[PDB]
Amino acid sequence: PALTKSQTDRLEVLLNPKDEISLNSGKPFRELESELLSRRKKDLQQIYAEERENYLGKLEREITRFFVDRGFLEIKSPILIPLEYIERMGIDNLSKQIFRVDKNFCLRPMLAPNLANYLRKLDRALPDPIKIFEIGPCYRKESDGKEHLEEFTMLNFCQMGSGCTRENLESIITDFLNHLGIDFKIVGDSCMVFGDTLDVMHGDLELSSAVVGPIPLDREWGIDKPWIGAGFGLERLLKVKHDFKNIKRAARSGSYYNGISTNL
């Protein structure tokens, strides 16, 4: 007969983009579920036998090699940060998205404040230009949606000193996304923290916001040179690469492994 909402939801959990299965063909739920369970067990068995790498971990390692090889220093900075960094970033109290931790701390919603501190400090020791990047967890309270996670993974690369032009920023973005095989376009947008941005779009999906400094916020962080930077969501990159319907397939999760349901 007809599938209930609970039944369709279960089949959607077990369905993957490579499948060609109609959920509403009239085939009974029991047979659709059994077929998809067999395909997903086979998929996980193949990963276990032949690959064994996590998609988020593997992508982080691929991105790390790209930027290290192009002269950027790899940064690993705190995830648990002072709440004061939030007001100083100019987040007047979307401040409602912040996860607070025991009074004076929060989970970082972006990598920029820690990277600003590193640019300032490293400019006292390293030759021009200063090039650094970080990949790691960031946290925002979000409405339920197909493109948002409350725990996600950011890449932010940035440069300070010479070479900090719009054309060089766009060239790095182009080489990076060409390396990953992802088509894109650049559109102007704006945001409360940085002002005008160059948004990197794949269709209607925002992969990145990028910024050409200086901006007035620089003084609050001791930044006094030209700079460029861009932030990318790794789970959004994986969603494009693997054609996932929902970004949850790509997230840190106990519910999916490399986009395969773990409820088998």
Ligand X SMILES: N[C@@H](CCCCNC(=O)OC[C@@H]1[C@@H]2CCC#CCC[C@@H]21)C(=O)O
Ligand Y SMILES: Nc1ncnc2c1ncn2[C@@H]1O[C@H](COP(=O)(O)OP(=O)(O)OP(=O)(O)O)[C@@H](O)[C@H]1O
Residues binding ligand X (CB under 6 A): 110, 112-113, 115-116, 119, 156, 158, 191, 193-194, 197, 209, 211, 217-218, 221, 223, 227, 229-231
- Residue from 60, 147, 151, 170 binding K ion (CB under 5 A): 151
Q: Which amino acid is at 140?
A: R
Minimal distance in Å, beta carbon 220 to ligand X?
7
94 lines the binding site for a second copy (CB under 8 A) = no
Instruction: Find out whether 130 and 69 touch, Cβ atoms under 8 Å.
Output: no
Measured from the CB atom, the residue of 157 and 244 that comes closer to ligand X is 157
Residues numbered 62-81 forming contacts with a second copy, rule: CB under 8 A: 64, 68, 71-80
The encoded tokens of residue 186 equal: 């650049």
The encoded tokens of residue 52 equal: 């064994």
Instruction: Find out whether 3 and 29 touch, Cβ atoms under 8 Å.
Output: yes
Q: How many residues bind a second copy (CB under 8 A)?
A: 49
Residue number with the smallest Cβ distance to ligand X = 229
Instruction: Find out whether 198 and 177 touch, Cβ atoms under 8 Å.
Output: no
The encoded tokens of residue 190 equal: 């704006």
List 75's β-bridge partners, or say none: 134
Round to whole Å and give the CA distance between 135 and 57.
Answer: 10
* Closest to 193 (Cα-Cα) out of 211, 206, 208: 211
Residues numbered 194-233 forming contacts with a second copy, rule: CB under 8 A: none
Q: Which amino acid is at 201?
A: M
**SS3 assignment, position 78:** coil
List 201's β-bridge partners, or say none: 185, 206
Minimal distance in Å, beta carbon 56 to a second copy?
5
Return the one option of ligand Y, K ion, a second copy, none that residue 44 interacts with (CB less than 5 to 8 A, by type). a second copy
- Residue from 209, 236, 244, 251 binding Mg ion (CB under 5 A): 209
Residues 44-63, one symbol each (x = binds a second copy by CB under 8 A, - = not), give xx-xx---xxx-xx---x--
Measured from the CB atom, the residue of 150 and 170 that comes closer to a second copy is 150
Residues that bind K ion (CB under 5 A): 19, 78, 151, 251-253, 256
